[PDB]
Design a protein around this nucleic acid. Structure first.
Ligand SMILES: Nc1ccn([C@H]2C[C@H](O)[C@@H](COP(=O)(O)OP(=O)(O)OP(=O)(O)O)O2)c(=O)n1
Ligand SMILES: [Ca+2]
Ligand SMILES: [Ca+2]
Ligand SMILES: [Ca+2]
Ligand SMILES: [Ca+2]
Length: 341
DNA sequence: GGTTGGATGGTAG
DNA sequence: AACGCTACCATCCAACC
């Protein structure tokens, strides 16, 4: 089984470079402006010339500007980056019927029937990289291994425009040598818990009682790691389907006044519905993000599709429920649509 | 005890 | 001196058979 994984390099930044070639070289920071006050926001991403200097995703713009005050700060334009993504994904289908679009800039390709061995995959990888640079002038990174996880890990190791193979031996090496914290699916909480149990490599999940691991990190993460560590992880490449469409927005100021939060909720509803486009949801959720940045939601599932007017009623009924059941001030409000017909 | 849906939690783009 | 947003799957807990 041979999986080729494709991840696009500093994608949003790079799309802007392509669209405005004058940007080439200069440090570019793609931003999300919450709009609260002038320069309030966070960084979606930055090119390598800014990342170079600590300007990474998630940091506040202000804090980025402290580091690189002369960088080019651009607002996010997801719909553009989306289009470009869409075109690249279509380019990738010329290489495999079995293709799993993972996110806005990742795809796993099951090439097991398309090449004999890793040499040929490597050659196919080079070919794909050129085809993308050819059509869309985006540079990407290709990771190759025996399953999805190690394909991705391969690409992490190659990242800034590259192609890496992980043969059967190197998989075994990384089971012993690779930091478990750097295993796709393991975020800081789990890494903390695992290190708090004394596990820093994949191998030492085979040294513990299964019910002990199952106790800390939950059943799934346990059964996951073990499956990897046993050189056994083999989850198939499968078409993914958008399961929800929604939108949440930062209010100008925290509020608990229903009438003050409403327009923000409705702006979100109108934007969600616009993004639904033929897709009819039977479930709605109002999502509130509180003062202290915690997430609170109440939803409802109908035996039918939800009309625009029904969203208008129910989102209000549900926001009212958040205000009754939670004392905190609300900072962000939004809506989330799901369970499609 | 197993399934199910609602709420939350964790993860990664 | 303050700090975005989208969305996936798993878990938790309680109703229910
Ligand atoms: N917290 C994040 C993480 C990612 N993204 C968006 C912008 C990224 O460019 C894209 C893909 O995430 P990546 O981690 O792959 O980031 P990059 O593509 O920019 O960098 P890299 O070259 O490492 O792939 O998703 C974002 O909105 N916010
Ligand atoms: Ca990635
Ligand atoms: Ca990327
Ligand atoms: Ca990690
Ligand atoms: Ca219930």
């Amino acid at each position: 089984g041979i999986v080729l994984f494709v991840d696009f390099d500093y994608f949003y930044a790079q799309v802007e470079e392509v669209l405005n070639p004058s940007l080439k070289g200069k440090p570019v920071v793609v931003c999300v402006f919450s709009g609260r006050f002038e320069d309030s926001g966070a960084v979606a991403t930055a090119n390598y010339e800014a990342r170079k200097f600590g300007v990474k995703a998630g940091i506040p713009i202000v804090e980025a500007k402290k580091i690189l005050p002369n960088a080019v700060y651009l607002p996010m334009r997801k719909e553009v980056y989306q289009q470009v993504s869409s075109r690249i994904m279509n380019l990738l289908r010329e290489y495999s019927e079995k293709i799993e679009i993972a996110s806005i800039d990742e795809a796993y390709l099951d090439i097991s029937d398309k090449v004999r061995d890793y040499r040929e995959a490597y050659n196919l990888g080079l070919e794909i990289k050129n085809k993308i640079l050819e059509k869309e002038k985006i540079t990407v990174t290709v990771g190759i291994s025996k399953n999805k996880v190690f394909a991705k890990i391969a690409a992490d190791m190659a990242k800034p425009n590259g192609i890496k193979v992980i043969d059967d031996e190197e998989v075994k090496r990384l089971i012993r040598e690779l930091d478990i914290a750097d295993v796709p699916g393991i975020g800081n909480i789990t890494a903390e818990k695992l290190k708090k149990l004394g596990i820093n490599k994949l191998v030492d999940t085979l040294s513990i009682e299964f019910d002990k691991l199952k106790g800390m990190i939950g059943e799934a993460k346990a059964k996951y790691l073990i499956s990897l560590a046993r050189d056994e992880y083999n989850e198939p490449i499968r078409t993914r389907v958008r399961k929800s469409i929604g939108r949440i927005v930062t209010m100008k100021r925290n509020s608990r006044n229903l009438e003050e939060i409403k327009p923000y909720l409705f702006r979100a509803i109108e934007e969600s519905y616009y993004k639904l486009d033929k897709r009819i949801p039977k479930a709605i959720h109002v999502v509130a993000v509180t003062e202290d940045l915690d997430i609170v939601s109440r939803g409802r599932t109908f035996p039918h599709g939800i009309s625009k007017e029904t969203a208008y009623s129910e989102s209000v009924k549900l926001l009212q429920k958040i205000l009754e059941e939670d004392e905190r001030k609300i900072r962000r409000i939004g809506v989330r649509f799901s369970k499609f017909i």
